[PDB]
């Protein structure tokens, strides 16, 4: 399955500067664009080679979209502070995420367009792409305004049409890397804690996409409550890393097995110390 996803963050900064607006866009786990209103002369900027060779009309139009959105979010931050009767002294955050998911058959599975204020759900476009869910009384004001303005029809046209068209264009132009799977490189390390126990750590390195499952078993039984799992983390080169650890009694290492599932593996892997 493939997705195109946009992430907007708007932050008010009383006393320090004008509000910040930063946008990033992704296809699957690969970023392709950034816009930051704090930059010297803010423009849409490429982050993937398969958007670097778009022409000037493409980049000029994306830049103008972002400039419009930054102004809209400056107004939105002021509107929300009024809705909630918040002090002008505080810094607040408005986030928006939207995009389109294609299912494994290549057809549109889901469009979404949702907002959070100060880290809490505010309003979201429902899966029918026609109605809204408001999280609180302030967001019901926005819901009435957007129902009156027929906002959902505009968003639906993007999410079902324009969004999918962009995603398909990028999947073709960036095919060499977006359609790739990089299997995890796997190994186990061993770390004595004391004379009586040691941690076994199972590693997955250099994989793409980021989705992965790492599990420890002991005589074929999952060690769910005993396993420490770090968050999947970017290597910095477009690939990802993860590890899973268990603390085992000294001399019982051979009862433990690590199990790795990933899109780039034909069969799940089994590792032993």
């Amino acid at each position: 399955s493939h997705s195109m996803r946009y992430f907007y963050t708007a932050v008010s900064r009383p006393g320090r500067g004008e509000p910040r607006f930063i946008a990033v866009g992704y296809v699957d786990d690969t970023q392709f664009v950034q816009f930051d209103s704090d930059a010297a002369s803010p423009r849409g900027e490429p982050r993937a080679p398969w958007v670097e060779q778009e022409g000037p009309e493409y980049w000029d139009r994306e830049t103008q979209k972002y400039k419009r959105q930054a102004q809209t979010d400056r107004v939105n931050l002021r509107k929300l502070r009024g809705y909630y009767n918040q002090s002008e002294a505080g810094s607040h955050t408005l986030q928006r995420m939207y995009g389109c998911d294609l299912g494994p058959d290549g057809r549109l599975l889901r469009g979404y367009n949702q907002f959070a204020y100060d880290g809490k759900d505010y309003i979201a476009l429902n899966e029918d792409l026609r109605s809204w869910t408001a999280a609180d009384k302030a967001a019901q004001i926005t819901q009435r305004k957007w129902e009156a303005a027929r906002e959902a029809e505009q968003r639906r046209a993007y999410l079902e049409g324009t969004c999918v068209e962009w995603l398909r264009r990028y999947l073709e132009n960036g095919k060499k890397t977006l359609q790739r799977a990089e299997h995890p490189k796997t190994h186990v390390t061993h770390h004595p804690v004391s004379d009586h126990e040691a941690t076994l750590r199972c590693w997955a390195l250099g994989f793409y996409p980021a989705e992965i499952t790492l599990t420890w078993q002991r005589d074929g039984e999952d060690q769910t409550q005993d396993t420490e799992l770090v968050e999947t983390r970017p290597a910095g080169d477009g690939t990802f890393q993860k590890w899973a650890a268990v603390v085992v009694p000294s001399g019982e290492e051979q009862r433990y097995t690590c199990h790795v599932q990933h899109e780039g593996l034909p069969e799940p892997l089994t590792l032993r110390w």
């Binding site: 946009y6 946008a23 866009g25 664009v33 493409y58 139009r61 994306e62 103008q64 979209k65 972002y66 419009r68 959105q69 809209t72 107004v75 939105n76 509107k79 929300l80 408005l94 928006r96 939207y98 367009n113 907002f115 505010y122 309003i123 926005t142 305004k145 906002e151 505009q154 968003r155 046209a157 993007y158 999410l159 324009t162 969004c163 962009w166």
Partner: peptide, 10 residues
């Protein structure tokens, strides 16, 4: 490409 038509004002 970003969602640019209209103005999504809260």
């Amino acid at each position: 490409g970003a969602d640019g038509v209209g103005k999504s004002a809260l």
